[PDB]
Amino acid sequence: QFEERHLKFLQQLGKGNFGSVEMCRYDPLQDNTGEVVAVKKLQHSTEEHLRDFEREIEILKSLQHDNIVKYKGVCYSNLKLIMEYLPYGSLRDYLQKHKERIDHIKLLQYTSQICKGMEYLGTKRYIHRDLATRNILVENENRVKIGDFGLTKVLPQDKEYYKVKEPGESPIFWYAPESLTESKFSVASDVWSFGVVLYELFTYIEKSKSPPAEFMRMIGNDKQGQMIVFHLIELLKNNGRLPRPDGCPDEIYMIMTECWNNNVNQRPSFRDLALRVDQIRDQMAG
Numbered sequence: 271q272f273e274e275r276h277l278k279f280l281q282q283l284g285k286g287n288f289g290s291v292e293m294c295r296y297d298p299l300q301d302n303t304g305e306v307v308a309v310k311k312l313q314h315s316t317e318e319h320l321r322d323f324e325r326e327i328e329i330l331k332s333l334q335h336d337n338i339v340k341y342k343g344v345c346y347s348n349l350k351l352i353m354e355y356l357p358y359g360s361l362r363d364y365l366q367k368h369k370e371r372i373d374h375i376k377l378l379q380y381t382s383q384i385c386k387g388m389e390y391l392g393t394k395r396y397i398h399r400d401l402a403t404r405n406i407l408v409e410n411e412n413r414v415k416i417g418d419f420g421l422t423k424v425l426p427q428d429k430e431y432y433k434v435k436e437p438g439e440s441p442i443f444w445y446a447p448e449s450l451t452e453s454k455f456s457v458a459s460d461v462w463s464f465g466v467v468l469y470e471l472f473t474y475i476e477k478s479k480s481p482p483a484e485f486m487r488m489i490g491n492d493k494q495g496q497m498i499v500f501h502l503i504e505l506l507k508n509n510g511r512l513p514r515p516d517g518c519p520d521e522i523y524m525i526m527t528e529c530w531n532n533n534v535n536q537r538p539s540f541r542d543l544a545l546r547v548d549q550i551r552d553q554m555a556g
């Protein structure tokens with residue numbers, strides 16, 4: 271395992287849901303030769319959150335894929351999850367800061383990698399429940415990885431959905447309608463959220479174009495608080511949706527809109543999404 275005393279704090283990397291990630295140097299020889307790693311811990315340790323965190327660690331450990339962040343180990347005294355350090359950070363921040371470097375061809379490369387990571391999740395009957403560019407990490411210019419699994423659940427053997435309603439705040443603007451109305455989560459709801467991820471990427475994370483900002487304008491910024499979810503549900507029911515991003519090819523927007531089907535069963539599979547994206551990639555290449 272990883273020893274507490276040899277883990278040297280460098281900087282705060284990010285915060286998500288109930289967890290917090292830090293950049294640390296694991297230096298067991300105490301000579302400044304150890305590798306830099308990412309360390310996740312609970313911001314406030316609750317027995318409920320500890321049980322969730324334990325399951326999260328088991329989830330990640332069970333995953334080995336090019337497009338999933340690498341598990342390295344755990345640290346015991348206050349449980350800590352040790353992951354590989356991915357030096358380019360979240361895709362959200364990377365894309366926003368370096369939009370001149372990243373073209374549509376690169377966006378589709380990332381899109382394909384996300385789909386392949388998600389198909390791998392589905393093969394283990396894992397539902398991510400929090401697909402968003404903030405949860406995707408960049409290893410290098412050519413490779414992204416699904417980088418957090420704080421909300422990830424395993425499907426029961428006998429059902430194709432999973433019902434969960436967690437205390438606090440949910441990413442409602444990435445949620446499928448049945449996740450908002452029924453608290454139902456499935457591969458199909460992950461596909462819906464993947465549509466939002468695709469939207470995010472093609473907006474190049476322009477602040478005014480974010481899903482929350484766009485939906486809030488459609489709902490009306492003169493919104494309440496508890497009624498926001500109620501109005502969001504109604505908007506989606508009446509086929510109100512995120513607009514086509516500036517400069518987004520019509521065929522890419524079609525993929526988004528097909529992911530955003532109210533009919534759960536009519537949403538494409540991650541396998542078919544990868545196929546469609548890779549086909550568009552090749553047609554943009556030659």
Ligand SMILES: CC(C)(C)c1nc2c3ccc(F)cc3c3c(=O)[nH]ccc3c2[nH]1
Binds near residue numbers: 290353359360
């Ligand atoms: C906020 C969230 C929990 C999604 C998170 N942010 C990061 C992150 C941010 C910047 C950075 F340079 C690296 C990371 C990082 C990382 O390197 N490994 C695992 C997770 C993770 C991370 N996980």
